[PDB]
Amino acid sequence: KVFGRCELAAAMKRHGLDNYRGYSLGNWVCAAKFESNFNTQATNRNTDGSTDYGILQINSRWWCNDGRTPGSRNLCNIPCSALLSSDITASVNCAKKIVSDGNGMNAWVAWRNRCKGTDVQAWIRGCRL
Template sequence: MRPSEPRALDRTFCPPKMTGALLVSLVSCLIAISQASLINRCDLARVLRKEDLDGFEGYSLNDWLCLAFVESNFNISKVNENADGSFDYGIFQINSHYWCNDYRSHSENICHEDCQDLLSPSLLSSIICAKKIVSGAGGMKNWVAWRLHCAGRPLSYWMTGCFLG
């Protein structure tokens, strides 16, 4: 074979069965990791109701569920970097420039929270901060995704099948 010709992959060190098993193991681990931070829609509704968000500042549980879905797809540990260098944290994607301190850039830290606390499975820090955001000017309109996908739309289906007892 001349040096300019591409060489076929040498599979002597990686038999096909081993490659398949490795791939299945890797995918299984990734699925387990990604699902570990998700919360079920109805479980989230129960938590939000327990924390008195149903009707808070005029917003129903349906509004809160829609917000959590469009912002994070119910991912409690989601972190997203924005074009301006700020980050959004947690199930409600709360921004580090205004609401929490991530110690990476200047923050007004209006909620007086470490951004990492917004990733807690208990959701308490996220809920307290979200209440502060909604209580201020603009309410849920502070979230662009809520304005685009939830505001003024029928949202009753978000509670379908959820028994809050």
């Protein structure tokens, strides 16, 4: 599923991401924009052989199982395929664990490079929330 901007913002809010670990909704929408262009089915292979899945491009090295990432963990206790669902519940739940890991949203390098320090509230402007 490719979400609309405000549609995703609404979904993330309903799932309790607004202000989660102090990150306003616009941060999460921004990160999703640059990680996946709001496409739940986005995947990308990393040089180390891991793969990133879903709207927030969650990595198989630590967070999900895909059966093909040697030496990896599955800390969100999910198949990586659940991160591709039209239902964002698994991605949000796993994102909550990631952003709690110590480095906040710096875990998403695209957030650090493209969202951090910018006017992230622009991403939820106009939305009914």
